[PDB]
Write a protein that binds this ligand. Structure first.
Ligand SMILES: [Cl-]
Ligand SMILES: [Cl-]
Length: 129
């Protein structure tokens, strides 16, 4: 599923990511935009053999199990396939644990390089929320 901008903002608010650990909804939409282009089925392979999955592009090195990342962990305790669902609850609950792990949203390189320090509010401007 490829979400629209206001459509995703709304789902993320329902699941509780608005202001979670201090990050407003605009940071999360902005991050999804550049991580996946709002496509829940996005996948990308990392040089070390790990793979990033779903709308927030969560990494198998640490957070989910795909059976093909030697030595990795599965801290969210889910198959990476569940991060590809048209329902975003698995991606949202794993993101919650990730952003609380010490470094905040700096765990998403793209948030760091393309959203951090920008008018993120413009990503929810206009939306019936
Ligand atoms: Cl915002
Ligand atoms: Cl980047």
């Amino acid at each position: 599923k490829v979400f629209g901008r206001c459509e995703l903002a709304a789902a993320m608010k329902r699941h509780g990511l608005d202001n979670y650990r201090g990050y407003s909804l605009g940071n999360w939409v902005c991050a999804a935009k550049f991580e996946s282009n709002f496509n829940t089925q996005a996948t990308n392979r990392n040089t070390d053999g790990s793979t990033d999955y779903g709308i927030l592009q969560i990494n198998s090195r640490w957070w989910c199990n795909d059976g093909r990342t030697p030595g990795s962990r599965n801290l969210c305790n889910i198959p990476c396939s569940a991060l590809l669902s048209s329902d975003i609850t698995a991606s949202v609950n794993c993101a919650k644990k990730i952003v609380s792990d010490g470094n905040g949203m700096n765990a998403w390189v793209a948030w760091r390089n393309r959203c951090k320090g920008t008018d993120v509010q413009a990503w929810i401007r206009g939306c019936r929320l």
